[PDB]
Amino acid sequence: DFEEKMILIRRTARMQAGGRRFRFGALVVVGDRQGRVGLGFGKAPEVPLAVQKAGYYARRNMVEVPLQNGTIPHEIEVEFGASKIVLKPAAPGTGVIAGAVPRAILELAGVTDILTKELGSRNPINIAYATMEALRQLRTKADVERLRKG
Amino acid sequence: VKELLEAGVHFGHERKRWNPKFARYIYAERNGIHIIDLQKTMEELERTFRFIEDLAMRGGTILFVGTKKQAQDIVRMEAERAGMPYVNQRWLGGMLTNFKTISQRVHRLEELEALFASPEIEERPKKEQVRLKHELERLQKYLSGFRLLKRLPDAIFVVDPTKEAIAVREARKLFIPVIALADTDSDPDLVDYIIPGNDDAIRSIQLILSRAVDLIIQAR
Amino acid sequence: MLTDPIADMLTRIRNATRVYKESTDVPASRFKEEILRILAREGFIKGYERVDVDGKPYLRVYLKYGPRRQGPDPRPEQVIHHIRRISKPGRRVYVGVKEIPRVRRGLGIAILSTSKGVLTDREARKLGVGGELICEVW
RNA sequence: AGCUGUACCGGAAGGUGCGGCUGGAU
RNA sequence: CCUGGUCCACCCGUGACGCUGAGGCGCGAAAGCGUGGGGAGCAAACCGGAUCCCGGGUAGUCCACGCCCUAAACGAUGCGCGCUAGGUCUCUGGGUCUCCUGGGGGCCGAAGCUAACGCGUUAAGCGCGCCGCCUGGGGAGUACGGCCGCAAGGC
RNA sequence: UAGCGCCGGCCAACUCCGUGCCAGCAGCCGCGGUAAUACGGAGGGCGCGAGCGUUACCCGGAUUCACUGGGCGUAAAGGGCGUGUAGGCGGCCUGGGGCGUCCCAUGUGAAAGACCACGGCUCAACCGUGGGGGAGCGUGGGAUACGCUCAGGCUAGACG
C-alpha cells in the first residue's frame, strides 16, 4: 500500500566496563506519491529491527500535503535547530531539484516540480525533520480564504 | 444555581496558587481566596452535560479518574452506578499510549483469578500460594475497575487536571476528549469540556459526579 | 526615544497575537489608521476602534484566530502568521510598478504607500503606480 | 585548586610578592 | 564643611528642546617611575636555618605633587526606547495601609529563544536607531613603520 | 583510422596474479608489512570519443564579506568607563513648496553581441532580414501617502 525509502543507517557506540556496545539507528520515509508522508527514526540493536521500528513510527506519523499540479502552493522557509530548508514552487517539466534527503521525502509526497535549498547545518536528521515540518506548514488559497473571510 | 453554593463549589484557592490562564473564570477575590463566577460555571456545565448525554445515548464510555484522597470513594461509588470503568488508586504511566502492554497484565489478572477459581491450587505448595496470592491482591488493588476496558474509551473524566496531568497529556496525545472538574490552579486550554468548580470540597465533587452519573443513567 | 512608530505597531500586533490576546492597544495616528483599515479589509483582524486612555487617543485593535485545534497543543491556528517591516528609517525602500513583489504567490499581501494613498500590492499594480514599501503580511 | 595584570629571582619541571577572577570543594 | 548622582508626591512651568556618538577631552584596582618626607606591622629580591617549611630583611605597601595608564577592568552580556503570564524573598519612598502603587537587588518559572547549558519584565524573547568588533588554528599581539612615556612599556 | 581516462568513499564501473610499510599511489580522507576491489600487470567493466587527460587562471559550490543573505553569555568577536564634535536616526495635528519618491510623454541608451520570428548556405556552426527589450541620464507635464523643508499649534518623549 505504501513505499519505503531508507535514508541512512548509523552505528552509534557507548562505553561499558572494558567494552563497546553498538546500536543502529535508521531514518525511513513512507509515502504513497499522492500526498501522504511519514518520517520515522528507529533505534534497535540490529539493523533489520531498526528498519522495522523506523517503518512503524513512520506509519503512525502521517502528514497530508496540498498538491496542485504536482507542485507546492507557495514557497516556504523553515528553520529546525541550526538547519534551514527553502522550498519554492516550479512550473511543470522542472523535476525535483533537491539534495538526497529532501528529494527522498518529496518524491513519496507526489511532488514532481520544486526548487529547494539547504542552509546552515546540513545534518540529514535535522534537514529531514525541517522538511517534514515545512510540509506540515503548507496552506492553499481555500484554506487561507476560510481562515480570513470564510 | 442554588445547588452549587451550599456544596462549596465556588470556593477556589488563595491568591498564590492561581494559574493566570484561569482569570476568565474568577468572579472576584474575597478574604484572600479566589471565588469562581457561578454564571459561567452553569453555562459550561450545560455545554458539558449536553455533550455527555449525546455521547452516552450514542453508546460511548467515560473513564473516571480521581486519584486524590477524598476523590477515591466518590469515583468508585459513582462509577459503580454505571457500566463505566474507573481509576482511583494510582494512574500507571502509560495506561493509554501503552494500552497493549497493560492489557497483557489484565489478562494475567483474569487468568490468575480463574486459577483461584480452580481446584488445582492443591498443587503449588503454600509458598507458591503465598506468592501468587500477594500478586493477586497487588493486581486487584491496582487493576480493578480499569478491568472493563476491552478497548480505548471515548472520553475521560478527571477530578484535578493538574493532579492527573499525565492522564490529561495521554488523552491529548490519542485525540480523546477531556472532561475535568478544574479549579483556580489549573490550565483551561488543555481541557476540552470544563466544569469550573472545586477539586477540594467533597460536597462539590459528590454533587457534580452524582448529577452527571444520574444524567448518564436517564440517557442510557 | 521611540524611533519608529509603524514598526512598533506591527510588533505590538505580533506580540499580542503570539499570546492569543483578544485585544491590543496602540498609540493613535492617521497613518496607522490607514494601515489598520487595509488590514481589516483583507480580513487579518476583527477590526479596530478609536478609544481614549487617560486623556490620550489610542487605537484598540481586535484580533482574529482560527478554530480550536485537536490533539496536543490545542492553540488555534494564527491568521497573521508573519508580519515584517520592509522600509525602516535608515534604509528606505521605494519601488516602481514593475518592481512590486508578489508575496506567497499572492496568498499574502504587501502594503504600499503610493502617492494615491495606502494601497495593497494588488491595487497598486491595478492602478499602475508605485511608492514606499511599508510591510509584507501573511 | 586553577587562571590572570604587573614586579623580581647568582636553589627556576619554576617560586614568591601585591591585587583580581571562578572559567574551583566547604 | 564644601559637592556630585538619584527616587517619590503635586501634575505647577517650557513646548520635541530628543537617542547614539568615529576623533578629541577627562577618569581609570594592583603593580611600576621621578622629586621630598615617613616607616608600626607585613613582606619580591637577598641572608640564614632542617629537608614546599621556619627565622631575619631592602624596595614596596603610607602621605604630598607629577608620571604610567594595564587585568579573569567579568554579568566574559554597548547605550536608548516600546511590547510579551505570573509566584516568592529583600531594600527604599507614597497612600485610603497586612491592600494597592513607584524605583532598585536576588530565586523559580508562561510564551518565546538557544548547538546545548541555560536566559526568561534586571531577556540571551518580539522590534526600531546609532556605535565598536568578528571571518580556521599556530607563527603573534610577534616584526616593521608611526604616535605616546624618564624607563618599564602602551597603542 | 580508434583512441584516452577511470573502476576504496565522494563517483558510473571487480576479480586473479607480482612485490609485502619496499616499489609505489593520492584532490581530501588516507592506502601499502601476506591478497591489496587504493601499489604493478591481466580478463572484464564504466565514461567520453578524433579526441581523452594533466597543469595554470577566473566564477560557482562558499549563506566562507551575508544589500538580497551571517554574527559577538561559554565556539573568533561588546571598546575598561564617562562627557561629548562631525555624522546617522527621530512623537501628534494643520497648511504651503514639490528636493527625494511615483506616474505619463518624448530624446538618447550607435554597429555588432544577448532574446524572439522568418530566411540563405544539402543540416549545424556561421550568416542575413525584421521585431523587440534595456539600467541610466536630459526635457515637458501630473501626483502629495511617506521621507525633506518651511509656517502654526499640542503634551504622551525630554527638561524645569
Curated annotation (Swiss-Prot), chain A:
- Phosphoprotein in keyword set: no
**UniProt-listed InterPro entries:** Ribosomal_Su5_D2-typ_SF, Ribosomal_uS5, Ribosomal_uS5_bac-type, Ribosomal_uS5_C, Ribosomal_uS5_N, Ribosomal_uS5_N_CS, Ribsml_uS5_D2-typ_fold_subgr
Q: Which PROSITE patterns match?
A: RIBOSOMAL_S5, S5_DSRBD
Q: Domain of life of the organism in this record? A: Bacteria
Gene Ontology BP, a term: translation
**GO terms under cellular component:** small ribosomal subunit
Q: Name one Pfam family in it.
A: Ribosomal_S5_C
Residues covered by the S5 DRBM domain: 2-65
**A GO term for molecular function:** structural constituent of ribosome
The UniProt keywords, alphabetically, are: Ribonucleoprotein, Ribosomal protein, RNA-binding, rRNA-binding
Subunit structure comment from the entry: Part of the 30S ribosomal subunit. Contacts proteins S4 and S8.
Give the family per the record.
Belongs to the universal ribosomal protein uS5 family.
Q: What does this protein do?
A: With S4 and S12 plays an important role in translational accuracy. Located at the back of the 30S subunit body where it stabilizes the conformation of the head with respect to the body. Binds mRNA in the 70S ribosome, positioning it for translation.
Provide the domain comment: The N-terminal domain interacts with the head of the 30S subunit; the C-terminal domain interacts with the body and contacts protein S4. The interaction surface between S4 and S5 is involved in control of translational fidelity.
Give any extra note attached to this record. Is positioned such that it could physically interact with spectinomycin.
What protein name does the entry list?
Small ribosomal subunit protein uS5
UniProtKB/Swiss-Prot annotation, chain B:
| Listed name of the protein | Small ribosomal subunit protein uS2
Q: Which cysteines are joined by disulfide bonds?
A: none
The gene coding this protein:
rpsB
Q: Which PROSITE patterns match?
A: RIBOSOMAL_S2_1
Keyword Cell wall biogenesis/degradation: yes or no? no
Task performed by this protein: Spans the head-body hinge region of the 30S subunit. Is loosely associated with the 30S subunit.
A Gene Ontology BP annotation from the UniProt entry: translation
Q: Name one GO molecular function term.
A: rRNA binding
The record's NCBIfam families line, in alphabetical order, gives:
rpsB_bact
| Keyword terms | Coiled coil, Ribonucleoprotein, Ribosomal protein, RNA-binding, rRNA-binding
Q: Which GO terms describe its cellular component?
A: cytosolic small ribosomal subunit
Residue ranges of coiled coil = 98-143
Q: Which Pfam families match?
A: Ribosomal_S2
The annotated subunit structure for this chain is: Part of the 30S ribosomal subunit. Contacts protein S8 and may contact the N-terminus of Era.
Q: Which family does it belong to?
A: Belongs to the universal ribosomal protein uS2 family.
Q: Which organism is it from?
A: Thermus thermophilus (strain ATCC 27634 / DSM 579 / HB8)
UniProtKB/Swiss-Prot annotation, chain C:
One of the record's GO cellular component terms: ribonucleoprotein complex
Disulfide cross-links:
none
UniProt cross-references to PROSITE patterns, sorted A to Z: RIBOSOMAL_S8
Out of the domains of life, which is the source? Bacteria
Q: What are the UniProt keywords, alphabetically?
A: Ribonucleoprotein, Ribosomal protein, RNA-binding, rRNA-binding
Does this entry carry the keyword RNA-binding? yes
Keyword Ribonucleoprotein appears in the UniProt entry: yes
Protein's GO biological process: translation
One GO MF term, please? structural constituent of ribosome
Concerning NCBIfam families, the annotation shows: PRK00136.1
PANTHER family from the UniProt entry = 40S RIBOSOMAL PROTEIN S15A
HAMAP family from the UniProt entry = Ribosomal_uS8_B
Subunit (UniProt): Part of the 30S ribosomal subunit. Contacts proteins S2, S5 and S12.
Q: What does this protein do?
A: One of the primary rRNA binding proteins, it binds directly to 16S rRNA where it helps nucleate assembly of the platform of the 30S subunit central domain. The combined cluster of proteins S8, S12 and S17 appears to hold together the shoulder and platform of the 30S subunit.
Q: Which family does it belong to?
A: Belongs to the universal ribosomal protein uS8 family.
Name listed for the protein in its UniProt record: Small ribosomal subunit protein uS8
Task: Recite the lineage of the species.
Answer: Bacteria, Thermotogati, Deinococcota, Deinococci, Thermales
**Gene that encodes it:** rpsH
